[PDB]
Assembly symmetry: none
Homo-oligomer: 175 residues x 2
């Protein structure tokens, strides 16, 4: 029960759902005895961070630039990305309140850490499988369609109210 | 005459470490020269979106999309194949739906794969889950743009509304 040392990113390797993904190997050390490795995608970092912006607005963390879906297999960058993520982890456990944070603990498996020979199992049980992502996406697009429709309705009604207000203002403008 | 009723031959469970169901569709033109097209539930749905796009007037059936419950079941698969079969009957039975760009690009009327080309044509026409998700996120972005613009206008209108109502309050006395 104290300061977690800066989790180390060893490197990354490209793995598969037979969609090719880049995954990062993060070694995290509890005590000089207990230590383990977790696999995280850039995306998992992004999600954790979004939850962090949500939970602690007061302190906000940097992350290297998103791919923007257009993929780069490239000099620097990927190295630069890893440096950035490493910085992210350092600052993330350096902040007294965001470190013992729950989502973070879930992220680094501080509570129920994976064993030496597992890491993959843990992996697959943390990141979103393609179907789940697809589902999530369809939810988001639909919800946006209904909501945006509701917004348009409110727009019409509020503008007509503006016409009413304007004319009554003319009426008590003369009298 | 012109290509009649594509009947679906069957299905096979495929993978890229996410499991596909693909449907083997038999497509004929004249008494001879028969060929095969490979399509998944995804593409059928896409085509259906295109028809609901250009031609609102008639809407076509498709078996229930199912998510979490087991994607591969006796009844579920059977109905899927049956319904899709129906979709096809309707798809070629109608005038202009037999000849339309998306429809011919779909059923490979012009350059149909006869030989092993079929497996090839698969990977060439269809959106795989990566591609599907990619596109879906692109769309989601654009929508968030549109809603950014709308919330901006609603904010303007509401600001004006409070301005007018305060003026009415001041001109009340």
């Amino acid at each position: 029960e104290d300061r977690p040392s800066t989790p180390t990113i060893l490197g990354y390797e490209v793995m598969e759902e037979r969609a090719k993904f880049t995954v990062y190997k993060i070694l995290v050390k509890k005590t000089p005895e207990e230590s383990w490795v977790v696999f995280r995608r850039y995306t998992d970092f992004s999600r954790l961070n979004d939850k962090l912006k949500e939970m602690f607005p007061g302190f906000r963390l940097a992350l290297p630039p998103k791919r923007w879906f257009k993929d780069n297999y490239n000099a620097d960058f990927l190295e630069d990305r890893q440096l950035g993520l490493q910085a992210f982890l350092q600052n993330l456990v350096a902040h007294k309140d965001i470190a013992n944070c729950l989502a973070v603990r879930e992220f680094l498996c501080l509570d129920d850490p994976p064993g030496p020979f597992d890491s993959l199992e843990e992996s697959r049980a943390f990141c979103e499988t393609l179907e789940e992502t697809n589902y999530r996406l369809q939810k988001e697009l639909l919800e946006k369609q209904k909501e945006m429709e509701s917004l348009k309705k409110l727009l019409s009604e509020k503008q007509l109210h503006i016409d009413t207000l304007e004319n009554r203002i003319r009426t008590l403008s003369l009298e």
